[PDB]
Design a protein around this nucleic acid. Structure first.
Lengths: 108, 93, 97, 79, 93, 103, 97, 78
DNA sequence: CGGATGTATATATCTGACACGTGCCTGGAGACTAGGGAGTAATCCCCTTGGCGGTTAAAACGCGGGGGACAGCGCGTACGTGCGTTTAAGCGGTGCTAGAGCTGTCTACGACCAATTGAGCGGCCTCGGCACCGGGATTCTCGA
DNA sequence: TCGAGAATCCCGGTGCCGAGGCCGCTCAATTGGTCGTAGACAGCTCTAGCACCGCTTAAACGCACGTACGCCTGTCCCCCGCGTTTTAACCGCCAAGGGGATTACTCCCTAGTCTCCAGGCACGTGTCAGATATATACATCCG
């Protein structure tokens, strides 16, 4: 009997292949769920999370603070033009509005 | 008391793997969990739609690879599909 | 009796409410307003505190977006002040009404 | 009743400032009172229906996040 | 190689409502698309709602709630009344 | 025998049940769900055809053209809210002239 | 001869093309545009005729809606002539880009 | 030149369906640009669906599904 | 309103999409079962409502005033339109080959269940990142 | 420009309570097989999207001429900023109850298999509703 080896480590992923596989099983998405589909979905999820977290961390470090809070995550989502298009409909609780001011409203 | 499920010890690993000296608050952790859940729902629903539309009954890696090229805008989709292919081809071996 | 020029307090106080995250509406007035509105559809209804905070924090971002669109429409008319007609125009172009 | 006026004129002022509005008219307050009432009715309608189907009498945060998700104004951080 | 349609089924309703009135094939295709669209709009909403409550059955109740959600007020009232009439005619028959 | 007839409907109940089974909406579908959904679909279709027939009578034509569908769906305050986003192919636009355009 | 006053010809045009159900755009130029834009992503894209017709219907409808919103914005500005800034306003509030 | 096939009178009548009185001369380039953007956005999704199908043709069903994703679903093609 | 035009209105003749037998097979409807999802029952306590009282920032009121929304003149300039013409778009055939679409294998792949156990969640301290603030150095601002 | 004044940032201090690390402790994720079957594949068909030539002609295009109106001058009024007076939000802490999560036990209702039968849609006929062209009043513009 081979020793237990988790499927996330088998593919070198930080999100679980098994849990995504179970969710696709019992989520009523298809009659049968493929084998590589869960690991592919886990890879996509972990890449997206890594990107949105890296941007938020950079923005927070710019703000001289170590903790990541919804403000610095709101800035990360609304700053990059690709995540803004991906999350156009989303509202973030306790997020605030990115600092902008119109040129016409400027003094004089 | 009956376990609820959350991607906490799962986003901690990614954050510590990308920023070894950064921490996340509970509220931002709740935002990240809801974002990952929403992306999962969107992509899985799109793959199910493709499977139903093409008169197929199983969502293989191809259906999720096609659905990503639709859901993810900009040059983000290219990196996402590249890393998905990398992960699946390493998993096959 | 130093008096700020009209507009100085407008270019100020606009920084405070943009850089910070807040609610900009008192808890209890909004709670009773929500109770009043919900009373019509069903009598004797109970709201979880989180279910009122979520409503408020999702209705703040709607008003903020509507006001931003109204401001843009008013700028189009070579003006600064925003009229109600700007608000009906914003809703009409948005397709909501 | 009459809590719609509870959303006070300084509240609309602060919201406009956060949005980026420099000068404020007089009737926009009443129009903001109207549009807020319409939007909250349109959300509470769905929230109460979702609660009623489940056969409970407490509106949870999840059953309001669902209603906002239906309208396309999805909210993160609750449920 | 067969395609399912709704031509006769819309035609019967038309004849019951307006006699001596005909439908061009384009309008029949439009009505078929409309029926197939509302069917999905209701069924998917009922499925998501049933799955949101740890339930695995779509009975008349989930669809009734879906009808109440997907329609405007004065139309939702009549639609729900029609649904209850049909079901009550059926539970007795 | 057709459940479509014991319930006194016009749309199928068998087709709706079969689609709900292979639509993969849930593992198990209720018994009154198909008849309820068929009744709702039939009511909406009857309303739409009634409006289209009224439009055809307005245009003095015995047949209903997609343009009649467009007029019927744009001329009502409640079915517009249900079909506001959608566009009828080969249809038209509601006759609309702004007030300031008039001399 | 008779020289129409500007505007009356425009309304004579409006009231006759409102009833129009036709497409207003020439089929071959639009089909060529669709083929050209398709060639960028992949080559040998054999377009079915019904697909081109559906795409034409969708594009026509979208442009009609955009010009309706643009007309609304232009009338707001105490103007009767369409300007590109009014199109930018419409495409900003609609949030398309 | 393929884009300039949609010429000034065609855009004028489209605007007339929009119900307008007077139209400026700078509208044409902006309209061509926005129609170009919308058409490429729809065609990318349609071609993606066709590539999923392992086919080399774009059927009307693919176009109506691509529009369905865009939130502008179209009746009258199946 | 004198005069003039593209505005509905009544008529003949297509004529081709719409309206109607049909049949047959193909999916729906009885017949019957059984096993697992759901309704009913109890309960209990976590969470919700209702309430008193001290505290004060926020709301309301009120007035000075100044900058902007608005009323108006004009002008020339960019946009209607009348018209020739000329340019390329639908019709309508021709040819035809590449690709969608429907069947027949049968095999590699996924559901399922029987052991097996470590990863992930519930719970418990705990110390330091950040909240709050005193106050000082610092930087806009507008009346001169 | 300039200088008193009004905000503002920040340096440093105290304080805290909530991420974070650690420790049980289940049960959902791993193996190991069978077992059926979805589709991967090959092949054959047939069909329509595509190419092209000419033809008729609808309208696209360029050149003008007229002119409607998009864009500084002055005005008055309404919204901002501050000073004073509330007053209801808020925070705390209490008390009481109710209904929302839990298990436990049926139990009955829909998935599943089978056999039968009628109805729904392609496959063929007619046929007549409305397009298409022709001649007659006219609402409104030129002026």
């Amino acid at each position: 009997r081979a020793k237990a080896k988790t499927r996330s480590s088998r593919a070198g992923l930080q999100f679980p292949v098994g849990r995504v596989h179970r969710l696709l099983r019992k989520g009523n998405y298809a009659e049968r769920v493929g084998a590589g589909a869960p690991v592919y979905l886990a890879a996509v999820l972990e890449y997206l999370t890594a990107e949105i977290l890296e941007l938020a961390g950079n923005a927070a470090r710019d703000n001289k603070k170590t903790r990541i809070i919804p403000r610095h995550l709101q800035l990360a989502i609304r700053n990059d033009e690709e995540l803004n298009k991906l999350l156009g409909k989303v509202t973030i609780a306790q997020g605030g509005v990115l600092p902008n001011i119109q040129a016409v409203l400027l003094p004089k | 008391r009956s376990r609820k499920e959350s991607y906490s010890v799962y986003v901690y690993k990614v954050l510590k793997q990308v920023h070894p000296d950064t921490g996340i608050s509970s509220k931002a952790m709740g935002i990240m969990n809801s974002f990952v859940n929403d992306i999962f729902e969107r992509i899985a629903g799109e793959a199910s739609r493709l499977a139903h539309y093409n008169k197929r009954s199983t969502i293989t890696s191809r259906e999720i690879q096609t659905a990503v090229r639709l859901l993810l805008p900009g040059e983000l989709a290219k990196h996402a599909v590249s890393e998905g292919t990398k992960a699946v081809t390493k998993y096959t071996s | 009796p130093h008096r700020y020029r009209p507009g100085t307090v407008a270019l100020r106080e606009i920084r405070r409410y943009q850089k910070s995250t807040e609610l900009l509406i008192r808890k209890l007035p909004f709670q009773r307003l929500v109770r009043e509105i919900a009373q019509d559809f069903k009598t004797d209804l109970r709201f979880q505190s989180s279910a009122v905070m979520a409503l408020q924090e999702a209705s703040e971002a709607y008003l903020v977006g509507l006001f931003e669109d109204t401001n843009l429409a008013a700028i189009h008319a070579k003006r600064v002040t925003i009229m109600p007609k700007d608000i009906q125009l914003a809703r009409r172009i948005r397709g909501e009404r | 009743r009459d809590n719609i006026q509870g959303i006070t004129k300084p509240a609309i002022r602060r919201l406009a400032r956060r949005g980026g509005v420099k000068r404020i008219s007089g009737l926009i307050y009443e129009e903001t009172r109207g549009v807020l009432k319409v939007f909250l009715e349109n959300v509470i309608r769905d929230a109460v229906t979702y609660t009623e189907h489940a056969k409970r009498k407490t509106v949870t945060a999840m059953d309001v996040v669902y209603a906002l998700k239906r309208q396309g104004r999805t909210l993160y951080g609750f449920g």
